[PDB]
Amino acid sequence: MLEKVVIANRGEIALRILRACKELGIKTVAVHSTADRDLKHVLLADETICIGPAPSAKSYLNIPAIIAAAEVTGADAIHPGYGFLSENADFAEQVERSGFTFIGPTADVIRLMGDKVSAIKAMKKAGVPCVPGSDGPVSNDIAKNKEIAKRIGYPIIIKASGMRVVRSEDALEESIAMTKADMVYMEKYLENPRHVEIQVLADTHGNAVYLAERDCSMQRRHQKVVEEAPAPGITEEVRRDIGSRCANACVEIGYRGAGTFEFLYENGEFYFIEMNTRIQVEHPVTEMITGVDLVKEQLRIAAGLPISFKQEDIKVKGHAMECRINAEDPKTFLPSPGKVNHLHSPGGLGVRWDSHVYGGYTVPPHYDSMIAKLITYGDTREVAIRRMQNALSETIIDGIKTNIPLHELILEDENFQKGGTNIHYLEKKL
Amino acid sequence: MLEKVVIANRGEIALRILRACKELGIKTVAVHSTADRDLKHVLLADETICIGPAPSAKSYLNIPAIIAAAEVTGADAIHPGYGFLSENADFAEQVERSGFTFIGPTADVIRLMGDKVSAIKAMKKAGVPCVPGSDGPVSNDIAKNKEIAKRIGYPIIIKASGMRVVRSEDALEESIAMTKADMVYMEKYLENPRHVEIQVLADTHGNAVYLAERDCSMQRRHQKVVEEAPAPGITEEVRRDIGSRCANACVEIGYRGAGTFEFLYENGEFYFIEMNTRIQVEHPVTEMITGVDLVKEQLRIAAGLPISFKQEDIKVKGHAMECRINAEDPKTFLPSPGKVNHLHSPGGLGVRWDSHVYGGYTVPPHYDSMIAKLITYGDTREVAIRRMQNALSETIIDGIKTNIPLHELILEDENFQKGGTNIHYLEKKL
Numbered sequence: 001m002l003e004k005v006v007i008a009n010r011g012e013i014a015l016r017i018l019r020a021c022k023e024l025g026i027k028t029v030a031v032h033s034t035a036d037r038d039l040k041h042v043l044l045a046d047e048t049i050c051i052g053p054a055p056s057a058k059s060y061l062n063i064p065a066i067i068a069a070a071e072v073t074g075a076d077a078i079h080p081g082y083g084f085l086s087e088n089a090d091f092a093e094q095v096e097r098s099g100f101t102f103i104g105p106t107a108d109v110i111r112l113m114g115d116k117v118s119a120i121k122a123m124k125k126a127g128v129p130c131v132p133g134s135d136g137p138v139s140n141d142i143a144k145n146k147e148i149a150k151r152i153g154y155p156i157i158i159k160a161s162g163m164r165v166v167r168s169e170d171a172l173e174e175s176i177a178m179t180k181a182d183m184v185y186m187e188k189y190l191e192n193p194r195h196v197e198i199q200v201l202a203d204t205h206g207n208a209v210y211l212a213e214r215d216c217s218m219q220r221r222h223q224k225v226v227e228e229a230p231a232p233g234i235t236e237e238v239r240r241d242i243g244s245r246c247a248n249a250c251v252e253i254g255y256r257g258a259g260t261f262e263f264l265y266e267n268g269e270f271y272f273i274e275m276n277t278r279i280q281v282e283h284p285v286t287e288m289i290t291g292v293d294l295v296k297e298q299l300r301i302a303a304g305l306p307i308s309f310k311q312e313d314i315k316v317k318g319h320a321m322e323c324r325i326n327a328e329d330p331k332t333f334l335p336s337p338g339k340v341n342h343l344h345s346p347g348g349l350g351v352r353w354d355s356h357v358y359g360g361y362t363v364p365p366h367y368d369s370m371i372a373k374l375i376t377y378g379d380t381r382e383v384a385i386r387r388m389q390n391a392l393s394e395t396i397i398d399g400i401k402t403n404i405p406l407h408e409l410i411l412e413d414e415n416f417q418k419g420g421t422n423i424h425y426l427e428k429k430l
Numbered sequence: 431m432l433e434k435v436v437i438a439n440r441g442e443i444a445l446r447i448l449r450a451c452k453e454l455g456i457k458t459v460a461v462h463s464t465a466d467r468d469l470k471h472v473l474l475a476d477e478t479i480c481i482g483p484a485p486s487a488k489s490y491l492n493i494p495a496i497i498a499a500a501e502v503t504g505a506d507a508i509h510p511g512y513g514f515l516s517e518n519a520d521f522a523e524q525v526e527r528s529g530f531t532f533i534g535p536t537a538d539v540i541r542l543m544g545d546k547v548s549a550i551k552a553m554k555k556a557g558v559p560c561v562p563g564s565d566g567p568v569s570n571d572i573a574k575n576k577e578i579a580k581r582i583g584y585p586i587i588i589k590a591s592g593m594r595v596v597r598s599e600d601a602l603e604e605s606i607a608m609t610k611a612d613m614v615y616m617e618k619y620l621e622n623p624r625h626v627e628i629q630v631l632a633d634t635h636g637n638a639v640y641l642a643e644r645d646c647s648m649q650r651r652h653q654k655v656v657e658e659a660p661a662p663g664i665t666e667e668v669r670r671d672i673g674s675r676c677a678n679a680c681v682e683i684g685y686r687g688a689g690t691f692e693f694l695y696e697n698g699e700f701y702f703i704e705m706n707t708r709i710q711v712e713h714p715v716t717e718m719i720t721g722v723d724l725v726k727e728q729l730r731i732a733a734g735l736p737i738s739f740k741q742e743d744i745k746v747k748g749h750a751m752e753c754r755i756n757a758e759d760p761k762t763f764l765p766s767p768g769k770v771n772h773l774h775s776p777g778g779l780g781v782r783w784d785s786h787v788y789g790g791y792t793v794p795p796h797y798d799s800m801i802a803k804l805i806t807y808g809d810t811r812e813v814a815i816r817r818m819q820n821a822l823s824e825t826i827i828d829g830i831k832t833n834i835p836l837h838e839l840i841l842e843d844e845n846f847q848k849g850g851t852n853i854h855y856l857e858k859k860l
C-alpha cells in the first residue's frame with residue numbers, strides 16, 4: 001500500500017496533509033522552495049528536499065524536480081494539495097507514467113473537466129443540470145449565433161473553454177469575435193446567483209458519495225473569503241437530488257478521489273459551472289458537519305481502499321463557517337508579508353484552527369497571502385456565527401496586517417446574518 | 431433573565447465561562463487578584479474588578495469581596511467554576527441570601543453531598559450503588575466494629591466524613607482510633623478499580639439527563655492527568671442503567687445544574703465515592719462525544735430554562751481524550767512558573783485547545799500549574815490517541831518546563847493503548 005507520500009505543496013494545506021499522513025502512519029517527504037525551509041510542516045516532516053528557488057515557476061511548479069524527489073526518496077505517491085499542479089494533467093500523467101500514485105483523479109479525467117465545453121458535455125450526459133447555453137462552441141456565422149443567443153435569452157455571456165457579457169443582440173458579433181482574443185461558447189448570464197458546491201468522494205471500488213454542500217458566495221474578485229455549510233435554504237430532498245446526480249456523474253466519468261461540483265444557484269435551480277478535480281481550501285466546513293476526514297479519505301482511496309462509509313451513514317448535523325485569514329491590508333487588499341512577532345490563536349468548544357503560522361514565522365512575498373483558516377461549528381448557523389465573531393476577537397496577529405477586520409464586518413452584516421446573499425454582495429458592500 | 435455574570439474564578443475555566451457567556455450575549459464581570467490582571471479572560475471581559483492581593487485566601491476565596499463585586503456591578507449571577515468556592519455551601523448560601531443566582535446547586539444540596547456519610551446515605555436511598563460499608567459512622571465499641579469489618583470483608587478502609595487502610599482485624603481498633611485524628615466510617619477497600627464518572631444535568635423544570643461517562647484512571651497523587659470518554663468496556667446497556675440511576679438521584683435530592691457522580695469501577699460493578707456538585711476540569715471530553723455545551727447549559731439552567739435537549743437526543747459518537755498540560759518538571763512535578771516566551775498551539779481536524787496562556791504570558795506561582803487542556807476527538811479511541819500524540823508533538827511551550835513528555839510516555843504505553851488501566855497504573859509506571 002502507500003507507505004511514503006510526497007507533499008507537493010506548501011503552507012496550510014501541506015500541514016493538513018502531513019497531519020493526515022501521520023495519523024495513518026504514512027511517512028512524509030516535504031518538498032520545498034528555498035524560501036519555505038521554515039514552514040511548520042517542513043520542520044515536522046520525516047524527510048525534506050529542496051526542489052528549487054523561491055519563485056513558484058522554479059519550485060512548486062517544477063515537474064521534473066518534484067518527480068525526482070519522489071524517485072530519490074522511494075516514495076509511493078504524490079499529493080498535489082490545491083493550486084499549483086493539482087489540476088495539471090501533464091503533471092498527473094508524468095507522475096503515473098513514472099510509477100508513482102497521483103493522489104487525485106486520472107490524467108484523462110483532469111483534462112476532461114479542465115475544459116469547459118467538454119466538462120459541460122459530460123455533465124449533460126450524466127444528467128447534472130447545466131446553464132442553458134450553446135452546448136458546444138460557437139462559429140462566427142453571426143446569423144446562427146444570434147439565433148442561439150435569442151433561444152437562450154439575453155443577457156448572455158461569452159466564455160473561453162480554457163469572459164465577456166452581452167446584454168443585447170447588436171453587441172453580440174463583436175462581443176464574440178473579440179472574446180476569442182483558444183475556443184469559445186456562450187451560455188445564459190445569471191445575474192443574482194449564489195455559489196453552492198457539492199462535495200464528493202469516489203473510489204476504485206465503484207463507490208461514490210456526496211457530502212452535502214457549501215455556500216461560498218462571499219467573494220471578492222472571484223476569490224472566496226468566507227464559506228459555510230450546509231448552504232442555507234437547501235432541504236435534504238434537494239440535497240439528495242443534486243447530490244445523487246453528482247455521485248452518478250463521478251461513476252460515469254470514472255472519477256477517483258475527492259472532488260467538488262460547483263454550481264451557480266438561482267431561484268431554486270442548480271447550474272453547473274466547474275468541477276474542481278482536487279481537494280478545496282474550504283473542505284473543513286464539510287468535515288465539521290459530516291464527521292468525515294476528507295484528506296484521510298483521499299489517502300485511503302489513493303492506496304486502493306474503499307471509501308470508509310456508505311451514503312446512508314452521512315447525516316448533516318449542525319452548521320460550520322470558515323474565514324480565510326490573509327496577510328493583507330483589510331481595505332486595499334495589498335499583501336502584507338513580514339514577521340509575525342506574536343500569534344495568539346483562538347480556541348474552545350467548536351473552534352478549529354488550520355494554520356502553518358507561528359510566533360516568529362515570516363510570511364514570505366512569493367506565494368499567496370493565506371496564513372490561517374479559522375473554522376467554527378455550532379448546532380445552528382447562529383451559534384457558528386457568534387462563535388466565529390468571538391474567536392476573531394480573540395485572535396491576535398502582531399507584526400503584519402490581516403483581513404480580520406473584513407471578516408468582522410461580514411459577520412455582523414444583517415443580510416449575512418439572515419443568510420443567502422449572492423455572489424456580488426460583498427463587492428457591493430465594499 | 432441572566433444579563434450579567436460574575437466569573438468567580440481564574441485561568442482556563444474563567445476563559446471557558448467567558449466564551450459561553452459571550453455566545454449567549456451575557457455581560458461579564460471578571461473578578462481577579464492583583465497577580466491576574468493579565469489573564470486572557472480579564473483582558474476580554476466587559477468589566478473588571480480587583481478583589482484582593484495574590485494569595486487565594488485574600489482573593490478568590492474572599493467571599494465578601496466577590497459578593498461586593500456582584501453588588502457594585504449590578505450582576506445577576508455568579509459562576510464559581512471549579513475549585514476555590516464552587517463547593518463551599520457557606521458561599522452558595524451567602525450568594526443567594528444576597529439576591530444573586532448561584533450557578534450551581536442550592537446550598538443545602540452542596541452540604542448534603544459535601545459530607546461522605548450523608549452523601550452515601552442519599553445515594554443508597556436513590557438506588558445508586560455504593561461501596562459495601564458501615565452505612566453510617568463507627569463507634570469505638572471495638573467488638574461491633576470488628577463484626578462489621580468482618581461482614582464487609584478485609585481489606586477495609588477507614589475514612590473521614592470530611593484515609594487509612596486495614597488489611598487485618600488486629601490492626602482495626604487502633605487503625606480507627608488514630609484515623610479520627612471530624613467523624614469516621616468504614617467501607618470495602620477496592621484494590622484495582624478504575625475511575626469512571628457519569629456526567630449529569632438537572633434543571634428547574636424537573637428534568638435530569640446523563641451524558642455518558644469519562645474514565646479518569648490515569649492519576650498521580652489522586653490528581654487526574656489524562657481523561658477520556660466514553661469509558662472503554664462500557665456498553666450502552668450498562669451506561670443506561672447506571673446513568674438512569676444517577677439522573678433519578680438528581681431528582682430525589684433536588685439537584686440543579688451540572689454535576690458528576692464519581693465511581694470506582696471494578697469487575698463489572700459501579701461503586702459511588704463522590705458527587706462533584708460543579709462543572710469539572712475534564713468536561714470537554716464529554717462535549718466532544720455528545721455535542722452538548724455543558725457550561726452553556728449551566729447558564730441556561732441558572733436562568734430558569736429547561737435543559738435544551740431530551741435524554742433520547744443524546745447519542746455517544748466517537749471518542750475523546752484530554753491531556754492536562756501543566757507548568758511543572760515532567761519528572762519531579764515541581765512547579766515551573768515564569769514567562770512563556772513563545773507558545774505554539776496545535777490544531778487541525780479533531781483538535782481542541784482550551785487555554786488562557788499566550789506568548790508573553792507569565793505563569794504565576796500563586797495558584798495551580800495548569801496552563802492548557804489539549805483535547806482530541808476521533809471516530810475511534812485509536813484515532814483520538816494518535817491525534818493526541820501528533821498534537822503534542824506540534825505543541826511548543828518555550829521558557830518554562832511542562833509535563834508534555836509525561837503525556838507522551840502515557841500515550842505510547844501499550845497498556846494504555848489497550849485501555850482499561852486502573853487508578854494505580856501511572857504511579858507504578860513512574
Ligand SMILES: Nc1ncnc2c1ncn2[C@@H]1O[C@H](COP(=O)(O)OP(=O)(O)O)[C@@H](O)[C@H]1O
Binds near residue numbers: 157163187189222423
Ligand atoms: N452563467 C454565468 N452567469 C454569471 N456568472 C458566471 C457564469 N459563468 C461563470 N460566471 C462567473 O465566472 C466565474 C468563474 O470564473 P473562473 O475564472 O472560471 O473561476 P473558476 O475556475 O472558479 O470557475 C464564476 O464564479 C462566475 O462569477
Ligand SMILES: Nc1ncnc2c1ncn2[C@@H]1O[C@H](COP(=O)(O)OP(=O)(O)O)[C@@H](O)[C@H]1O
Binds near residue numbers: 587
Ligand atoms: N473504597 C475505596 N477503595 C479504594 N480506594 C478508595 C476508596 N474510597 C476512596 N478511595 C481513594 O481515595 C480517593 C478519594 O480521595 P479524596 O481526597 O476524597 O478525593 P475526592 O474529593 O476526589 O473524592 C479515591 O480516588 C480513591 O483512590
